[PDB]
Amino acid sequence: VSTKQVLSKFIEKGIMKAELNEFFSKEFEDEVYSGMEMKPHEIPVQITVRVNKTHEVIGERKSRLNRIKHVLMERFPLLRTGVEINVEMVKNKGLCPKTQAEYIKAKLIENVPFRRAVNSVMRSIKESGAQGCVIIVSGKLKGQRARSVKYADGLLIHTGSSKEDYVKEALSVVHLKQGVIGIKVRIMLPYDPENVNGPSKVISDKIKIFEPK
Amino acid sequence: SVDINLEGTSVEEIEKVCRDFYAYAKTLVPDMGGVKRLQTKKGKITTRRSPCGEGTNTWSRYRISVHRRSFSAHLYPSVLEKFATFLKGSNVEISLVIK
Amino acid sequence: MKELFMVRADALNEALAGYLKSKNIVKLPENFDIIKTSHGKQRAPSDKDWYYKRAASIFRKLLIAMHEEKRIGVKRLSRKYGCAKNRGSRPSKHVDGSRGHIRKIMQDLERAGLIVKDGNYRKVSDMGIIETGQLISQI
Amino acid sequence: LIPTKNILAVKRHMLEKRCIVVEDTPKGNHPVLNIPNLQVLNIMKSLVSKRYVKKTFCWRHGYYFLEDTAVDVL
Amino acid sequence: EKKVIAIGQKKTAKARSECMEGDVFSVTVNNVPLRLLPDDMMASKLRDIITRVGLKYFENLVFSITVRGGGPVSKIYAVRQAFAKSLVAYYGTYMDEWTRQEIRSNLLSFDKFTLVADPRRAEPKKY
Amino acid sequence: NIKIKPGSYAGRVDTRKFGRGSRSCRACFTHRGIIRQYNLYLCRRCFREYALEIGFKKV
RNA sequence: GCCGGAUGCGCAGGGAGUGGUGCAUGGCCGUUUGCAACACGUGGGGUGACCUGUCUGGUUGAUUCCGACAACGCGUGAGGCCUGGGGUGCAGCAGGCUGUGCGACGGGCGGCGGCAAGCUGCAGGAGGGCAGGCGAAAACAGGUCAGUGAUGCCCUCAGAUGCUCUGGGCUGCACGCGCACUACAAUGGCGCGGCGAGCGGGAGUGCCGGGAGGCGCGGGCGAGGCCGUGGCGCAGCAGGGAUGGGGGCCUGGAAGGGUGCCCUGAACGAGGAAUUCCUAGUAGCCGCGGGUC
Ligand SMILES: [Zn+2]
């Protein structure tokens, strides 16, 4: 029994997932792309792709969604047998950081000033229930010198196991007349026992005390 | 003679799988063996952090570990198929040996 | 074989090697007086009867591997007879023993009937069990 | 350049279904249309230059799509 | 009939011991008797335990100790812990218990690592 | 009566068969620092960006 | 050699470039950090920049806390945390494996300090600063355009700064320097016998050969050393193994590569001014395995 063999096949399922998520972002660059999740160990591989719009991405009534599914049957021999992709829209568009990341990318394409762009998102994050949001805009914003302007508010943790639960961060790159601008959006999630809004387990430092009466 | 072999990287998922399968197996048979956990086959990759040679010897170690569970019994092939239909809502990799 | 260990180990060896020389059941090669015994060694063995003394050491290793209920070959056995090679300015790396004389010294242990093969592994036989039994009775 | 035999062989192929080509030019015999690879990429490079098909690149592989708007033209 | 198993260990050297009500006292560590051990420090580190406890407690107890792993010197302290641990575990199972408390207090005052494990493991630094 | 080596005017039949340059990163076209370990075949610099996406934990 | 000089009617323009610019950039990484700092809401002081909050003192690895306080409440970082390590409760299964918990908090005690925070000794205990991980704000003209189907701009594009092939170089050598290796030996070296690890768990076997190596089957591994003992015996000596000669092989298309055999047997007899690293299973010694291949 080989330990080398078992690890190699699992990351083989992993290395296609890294390619596929890299593929979908370039594929749905006109839309908002919010990530994907994969269930590959079954005989039908089920791909859930998260895009802000549902009716546009499926495309000419299931045409282009099967057209992009057709070439994915060709590329990956690992489970070439059965693949099914089905799109979903994010429940809160503010809480996904890529949704806000590609938003200001579209604003910078339209030559909107980034300061007007950045307060538009961090207001929309706060009104959507999220706990804290930092927006980092790096690039040649004014002039040839490049600055890394960093707007922030609210509770955003940086260390702990709660970091991988509670902050979800994004990176989108912008190509303009002047050069390359990178916009990092890192958003803290509100705690909710049902995981549709945030993590189920609380941050470890927070405690609850019952009441004596 | 059935060998139900299942492998998974997430442990809180593969323990929910073996729990509901053992809830399914005791409905079937009482001579069903307990869930046996083989050696967690683990692997590490050590990598330089810098995409250049400006820094100190800063090495980031990434790890993968897959957890294995097994079941052994001697059943009917129709029971093997309804076992097989049970473990497809699970993301754990499933493979079976009938010898 | 518990009574194998109840005598001294090196005192068993010349009692075993002197048995293999007196009974003439291990035969010397042509170049026996000049064998490096490893490519890590710097000299040939200084002992004139080194060949028998190794034949006692190899037959003892097959004896204990039977006591551990384990099978041993010639290539794995050469690793027990390897030294660390003075590699010059490089660090002294461990190297394997010389396989060539170990293979012939076991084939003579097949001719005496001490060692009978089991599958692709040679094993100690009952004849090797008995003839050790008179030896360790005397030590 | 290249013979019109394998030009229209993949051009008739594209009208039913979309093909993807690796940039591995020393690899020959494309997995679908067993033709040398540096042939088949150059004409689809002509197709994007004539603005017919759309090209998406990800990890050494070019995913070429012919959108439905240009399909009825061809 | 009467048989107990206790384990002691140094750094990565683990040692089992089996204590039985044999005919005469004997310690056959790693299938080798105590008088014929090639390493005398292996033999003396067993013998001072017999010197501390006194030979009257080892009246009929046969110790078949096996050891594996570790180097030479950590094998000495592996069996030395395992020899004493199996000695007190025999009295706790098959003999009177207040003598076992008498023996345990004798050994713990003698040296702590005879009966408890040395937690000191090979703790390597990084680069 | 010597064997004449099959291939080019020079000896080798097919280049890119041996050594660094036959292999590349499966993401960024480079011959520099490929992790062939566990059959990954992506480079050192790409493996940071895709590590936890494979299922690797830092820990 | 070859044209990935597409495409719009020789030109236009795209595309390509390990060409240039990291002082045009993204990302990432380094360094400040092996740090303990940073900030808001409101209020107060000042015309104001600012200050207080964020502190006399005490304390802590920590702006950690006690406390006095024109501040009061918060937030990041610190902590909490996550992983491995030791102890054992239960459960399951078969160089034993992996789930689930428990166990340590500085709790107890003594003495200092007393709204104290805490410090310190001992007992108990497997354990009383274990090893890692994530790691704030701000910077730096830090490094990377040679990781990139990340890229602006400039230059090049047919006698090309494109690709590819072959050969050579990156391995040149009066010399300066960094980091390591092996040593200068007797606490040693050499020759046999004996006993022999962990990470990593795929590999042994039979035959040929003096070795390297070869061949044929093929579910399948273990070190320096230490102990015992024989020789040498203070010697540029059986220390040292540099350099070189002749032969045998391996890999590859191709040896300057590796390995093996024999022989030659250099400096080096403890290393100037200087200077690095390190507090316990640690330094050091000693091998082994993995990445590269
Ligand atoms: Zn790469």
mmCIF file of C-alpha atoms in Angstrom, chain A residues 57-177:
data_model
loop_
_atom_site.group_PDB
_atom_site.id
_atom_site.type_symbol
_atom_site.label_atom_id
_atom_site.label_comp_id
_atom_site.label_asym_id
_atom_site.label_seq_id
_atom_site.Cartn_x
_atom_site.Cartn_y
_atom_site.Cartn_z
ATOM 1 C CA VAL A 57 -24.760 33.103 -17.559
ATOM 2 C CA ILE A 58 -26.764 30.000 -18.542
ATOM 3 C CA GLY A 59 -27.041 31.525 -21.954
ATOM 4 C CA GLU A 60 -29.477 31.081 -24.857
ATOM 5 C CA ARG A 61 -31.486 28.592 -22.757
ATOM 6 C CA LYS A 62 -28.759 26.204 -21.506
ATOM 7 C CA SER A 63 -26.796 26.599 -24.757
ATOM 8 C CA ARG A 64 -23.510 28.189 -23.698
ATOM 9 C CA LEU A 65 -23.559 26.505 -20.289
ATOM 10 C CA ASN A 66 -23.477 23.152 -22.052
ATOM 11 C CA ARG A 67 -21.065 24.628 -24.597
ATOM 12 C CA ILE A 68 -18.600 25.448 -21.823
ATOM 13 C CA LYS A 69 -19.432 22.087 -20.251
ATOM 14 C CA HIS A 70 -18.569 20.398 -23.546
ATOM 15 C CA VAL A 71 -14.987 21.642 -23.621
ATOM 16 C CA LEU A 72 -14.524 20.719 -19.946
ATOM 17 C CA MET A 73 -15.468 17.144 -20.786
ATOM 18 C CA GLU A 74 -12.641 17.307 -23.322
ATOM 19 C CA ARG A 75 -9.917 18.892 -21.201
ATOM 20 C CA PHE A 76 -9.929 16.934 -17.944
ATOM 21 C CA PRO A 77 -9.611 13.148 -18.319
ATOM 22 C CA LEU A 78 -10.207 12.775 -14.602
ATOM 23 C CA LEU A 79 -13.954 12.081 -14.505
ATOM 24 C CA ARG A 80 -14.446 12.838 -18.184
ATOM 25 C CA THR A 81 -17.491 10.547 -17.719
ATOM 26 C CA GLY A 82 -19.892 12.791 -15.840
ATOM 27 C CA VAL A 83 -19.762 16.532 -15.214
ATOM 28 C CA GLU A 84 -22.695 18.845 -14.486
ATOM 29 C CA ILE A 85 -22.342 22.562 -13.828
ATOM 30 C CA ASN A 86 -25.163 24.655 -12.366
ATOM 31 C CA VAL A 87 -24.945 28.334 -11.544
ATOM 32 C CA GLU A 88 -26.172 29.948 -8.318
ATOM 33 C CA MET A 89 -26.422 33.620 -7.343
ATOM 34 C CA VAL A 90 -24.918 34.844 -4.087
ATOM 35 C CA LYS A 91 -27.439 35.486 -1.337
ATOM 36 C CA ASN A 92 -25.857 38.774 -0.262
ATOM 37 C CA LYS A 93 -23.891 40.438 -3.043
ATOM 38 C CA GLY A 94 -22.238 42.805 -0.572
ATOM 39 C CA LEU A 95 -20.731 40.088 1.600
ATOM 40 C CA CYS A 96 -18.883 38.375 -1.233
ATOM 41 C CA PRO A 97 -15.601 40.272 -1.646
ATOM 42 C CA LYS A 98 -15.044 39.412 -5.321
ATOM 43 C CA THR A 99 -18.478 40.853 -6.110
ATOM 44 C CA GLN A 100 -17.305 44.124 -4.642
ATOM 45 C CA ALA A 101 -13.851 43.667 -6.181
ATOM 46 C CA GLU A 102 -15.054 43.423 -9.780
ATOM 47 C CA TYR A 103 -17.501 46.247 -9.041
ATOM 48 C CA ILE A 104 -14.872 48.947 -8.562
ATOM 49 C CA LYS A 105 -12.884 47.403 -11.411
ATOM 50 C CA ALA A 106 -15.835 48.293 -13.644
ATOM 51 C CA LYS A 107 -15.818 51.761 -12.094
ATOM 52 C CA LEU A 108 -12.138 52.299 -12.876
ATOM 53 C CA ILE A 109 -12.777 51.109 -16.439
ATOM 54 C CA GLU A 110 -15.419 53.846 -16.685
ATOM 55 C CA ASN A 111 -12.832 56.419 -15.428
ATOM 56 C CA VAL A 112 -14.863 56.995 -12.249
ATOM 57 C CA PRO A 113 -12.650 58.389 -9.444
ATOM 58 C CA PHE A 114 -11.680 55.614 -7.067
ATOM 59 C CA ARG A 115 -12.520 57.646 -3.959
ATOM 60 C CA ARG A 116 -16.099 57.892 -5.212
ATOM 61 C CA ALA A 117 -15.900 54.184 -6.027
ATOM 62 C CA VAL A 118 -14.508 53.091 -2.666
ATOM 63 C CA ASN A 119 -17.063 54.806 -0.434
ATOM 64 C CA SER A 120 -19.847 53.406 -2.602
ATOM 65 C CA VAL A 121 -18.829 49.826 -1.807
ATOM 66 C CA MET A 122 -17.919 50.206 1.876
ATOM 67 C CA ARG A 123 -21.282 51.855 2.448
ATOM 68 C CA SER A 124 -22.948 48.976 0.613
ATOM 69 C CA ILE A 125 -20.984 46.429 2.640
ATOM 70 C CA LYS A 126 -22.002 48.073 5.916
ATOM 71 C CA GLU A 127 -25.680 48.328 4.989
ATOM 72 C CA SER A 128 -25.641 44.630 4.021
ATOM 73 C CA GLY A 129 -24.823 43.542 7.572
ATOM 74 C CA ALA A 130 -21.105 42.814 7.329
ATOM 75 C CA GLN A 131 -18.897 43.574 10.297
ATOM 76 C CA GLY A 132 -15.816 45.214 8.789
ATOM 77 C CA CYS A 133 -14.353 45.963 5.365
ATOM 78 C CA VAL A 134 -10.901 47.148 4.291
ATOM 79 C CA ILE A 135 -10.375 48.236 0.688
ATOM 80 C CA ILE A 136 -6.788 48.467 -0.563
ATOM 81 C CA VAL A 137 -6.277 50.215 -3.903
ATOM 82 C CA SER A 138 -2.739 50.045 -5.268
ATOM 83 C CA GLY A 139 -1.482 51.582 -8.486
ATOM 84 C CA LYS A 140 -0.721 54.810 -10.309
ATOM 85 C CA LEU A 141 -3.905 56.581 -9.298
ATOM 86 C CA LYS A 142 -2.718 60.192 -9.581
ATOM 87 C CA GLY A 143 0.426 60.758 -11.617
ATOM 88 C CA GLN A 144 3.319 58.457 -12.389
ATOM 89 C CA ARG A 145 4.067 57.713 -8.728
ATOM 90 C CA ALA A 146 2.104 54.772 -7.364
ATOM 91 C CA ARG A 147 0.354 54.896 -4.002
ATOM 92 C CA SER A 148 -1.451 52.200 -2.027
ATOM 93 C CA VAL A 149 -4.556 53.937 -0.710
ATOM 94 C CA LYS A 150 -6.209 51.991 2.094
ATOM 95 C CA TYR A 151 -9.747 52.707 3.306
ATOM 96 C CA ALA A 152 -10.925 50.758 6.352
ATOM 97 C CA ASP A 153 -13.590 50.634 9.052
ATOM 98 C CA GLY A 154 -15.022 48.331 11.668
ATOM 99 C CA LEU A 155 -13.784 45.203 13.374
ATOM 100 C CA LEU A 156 -11.467 43.260 11.087
ATOM 101 C CA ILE A 157 -9.360 40.547 12.685
ATOM 102 C CA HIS A 158 -5.996 39.533 11.295
ATOM 103 C CA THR A 159 -4.818 36.575 13.414
ATOM 104 C CA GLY A 160 -6.473 33.450 14.745
ATOM 105 C CA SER A 161 -8.332 30.446 13.455
ATOM 106 C CA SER A 162 -11.299 32.788 13.094
ATOM 107 C CA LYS A 163 -9.421 34.558 10.275
ATOM 108 C CA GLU A 164 -10.074 31.699 7.856
ATOM 109 C CA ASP A 165 -13.743 31.705 8.843
ATOM 110 C CA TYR A 166 -14.632 35.335 9.300
ATOM 111 C CA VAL A 167 -12.661 37.355 6.738
ATOM 112 C CA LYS A 168 -13.046 36.515 3.063
ATOM 113 C CA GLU A 169 -10.684 38.459 0.856
ATOM 114 C CA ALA A 170 -10.502 39.131 -2.858
ATOM 115 C CA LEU A 171 -8.069 40.368 -5.470
ATOM 116 C CA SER A 172 -8.926 41.746 -8.888
ATOM 117 C CA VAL A 173 -6.474 43.430 -11.255
ATOM 118 C CA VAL A 174 -7.298 46.314 -13.591
ATOM 119 C CA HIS A 175 -5.500 47.202 -16.817
ATOM 120 C CA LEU A 176 -5.856 50.839 -17.835
ATOM 121 C CA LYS A 177 -4.254 53.461 -20.053
#
